[PDB]
Design a binder for these strands. Structure first.
Ligand code: MN
Ligand code: MN
Ligand code: ZN
Length: 461
RNA sequence: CAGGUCUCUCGUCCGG
RNA sequence: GCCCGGACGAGAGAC
């Protein structure tokens, strides 16, 4: 992905949009009980903890477009992936405006608690004004659709979230793209039946984990993988995609029956954004925040991964590839062992910076011991070895609990962390409860017992 | 009061 | 006891 032009948004007829400049993250009652290296991310240029120019750091991720032409291997990839999705029998119809708006089986309703983007954002108009869940009223949305049309610009925002130290000092904050309510509606009418199919089918046919529940899906994953594993994350995924990959995606869509609306994908591939005063244009790069972000990322991953095998391993049989993606996050297997360092080296030709799934510095051999998917480890149960724990490191849970966006959420927050931490086992779970209860507010919370969570887990099978 | 697209789960409240 | 559905809030995860 690459920035085409930044100019005062005054010159282009666009309003100045000014986001909040303050973190909503105050430190938690458990701030000193537990340790951690994470602070809220840099939101503005005037941040003391910055050791670099902010605005140059945030947009740093637009590294350019390596390729623009779907090569022969991308084409065999496209062929094989799209052949996979055929079996799903994915309904290819437009989805009616009422469902695009208020949800249907496999597709949730639009989030009435997040903004309506451009232009509503600068009119002081919100989704609640336009949408009505009780009534499922599509009338005022249609009127807005007629009036403002689609292909509206996205409003860039810095994500208010916890960041490492180097990420605060290097102003490496994450930026989302606030899709307009019009395009979310437009995109979901076009693609809603595809999003639903994906949601309903996490696994190796779709190559996607969107729609999974790790408590239950971890027990499935090993039975779905072939004998030898490899795995990756990527560096700056969305913005490291060059136009070639969008044409490859357009190509998958056409082959599965979405030919007519493949144009929308061009509006993703060439997008306009509003950022504070500026107005800028991007070519390549996934507009994270647009409808389908997750699904298109994971789909492009499946292509990227087939492509790189075909190039690196002559005669590789993609029919014995098994892979699951959640955006750039991927776990994959093949009947014979493949080399992630090599695969990652070809990936650079296509503009991809690839890594170990833990953002570790160097690729190891990947075993059912070191492999991680979505930050979690895999550990067989000791009584029931076919049932597998999603084991997230206590380090992570520690980092979270030390902060709050609002003190009145402590019960839910900590309670939620308990449902992650007990997979580390009774001995580690009870130490957790001890530390939590080491403070007076801790002794106020209703926390679940190891044994209760264990029987819940087993019962849920 | 400002900050996207989603998935999953938990919690609160209301239903069949 | 067991299903199932809705509204709202939170946490985690991907971008
Ligand atoms: Mn990444
Ligand atoms: Mn990732
Ligand atoms: Zn443009």
């Amino acid at each position: 992905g690459e920035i085409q032009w930044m100019r005062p948004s005054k010159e282009v007829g666009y309003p100045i949009i000014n986001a909040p400049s303050k973190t909503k993250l105050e430190p938690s009652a458990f701030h000193y009980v537990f340790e951690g290296v994470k602070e809220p991310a840099v939101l503005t240029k005037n941040d003391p903890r910055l050791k670099t120019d902010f605005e140059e750091a945030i947009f740093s991720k637009y590294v350019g477009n390596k390729i623009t032409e779907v090569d022969e291997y991308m084409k065999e990839a496209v062929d094989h992936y799209a052949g996979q999705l055929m079996s799903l029998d994915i309904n290819t119809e437009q989805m009616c405006l009422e469902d695009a708006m208020y949800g249907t089986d496999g597709l949730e309703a639009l989030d009435l608690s997040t903004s309506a983007g451009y232009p509503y954002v600068a009119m002081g108009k919100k989704k609640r004004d336009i949408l009505n869940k009780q009534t499922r009223d599509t009338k005022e949305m249609q009127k807005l659709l007629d009036t403002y049309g689609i292909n509206l610009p996205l409003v860039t925002y810095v994500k208010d979230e916890l960041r490492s130290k180097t990420k605060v000092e290097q102003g490496k904050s994450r930026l989302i793209e606030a899709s307009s309510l019009n395009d979310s509606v437009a995109m979901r009418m076009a693609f809603g039946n595809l999003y639903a199919a994906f949601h309903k089918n996490p696994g190796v046919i779709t190559g996607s984990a969107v729609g999974c529940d790790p408590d239950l899906f971890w027990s499935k994953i090993p039975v779905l993988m072939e004998e030898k594993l490899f795995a990756f994350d990527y560096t700056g995924y969305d913005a490291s995609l060059s136009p070639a990959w969008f044409e490859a995606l357009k190509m998958v869509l056409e082959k599965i029956g979405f030919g007519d609306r493949v144009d929308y994908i061009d509006y993703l591939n060439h997008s306009h954004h509003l950022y504070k005063n500026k107005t800028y244009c991007v070519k390549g790069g996934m507009p994270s925040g647009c409808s389908g972000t997750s699904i298109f990322n994971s789909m492009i991953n499946n292509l990227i991964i087939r492509t790189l095998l075909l190039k690196t391993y002559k005669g590789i049989d993609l029919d014995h590839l098994k892979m699951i993606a959640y955006g750039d996050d991927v776990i994959a297997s093949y009947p014979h062992e493949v080399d992630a360092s090599l695969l990652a080296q070809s990936g650079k030709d296509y503009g991809l910076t690839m890594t170990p799934a833990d953002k570790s510095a160097t690729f190891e051999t990947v075993t059912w011991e070191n492999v991680t998917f979505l930050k979690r480890f895999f550990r067989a149960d000791e009584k029931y070895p076919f049932l597998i724990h999603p084991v997230m490191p206590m380090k992570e849970i520690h980092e979270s609990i030390r902060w709050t966006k609002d003190p009145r959420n402590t019960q839910d927050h900590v309670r939620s962390l308990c449902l992650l931490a007990w997979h580390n086992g009774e001995e580690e779970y009870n130490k957790f409860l001890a530390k939590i209860r080491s403070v007076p507010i801790g002794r106020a919370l209703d926390l679940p017992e190891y044994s209760t969570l264990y029987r819940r887990w087993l019962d849920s099978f």
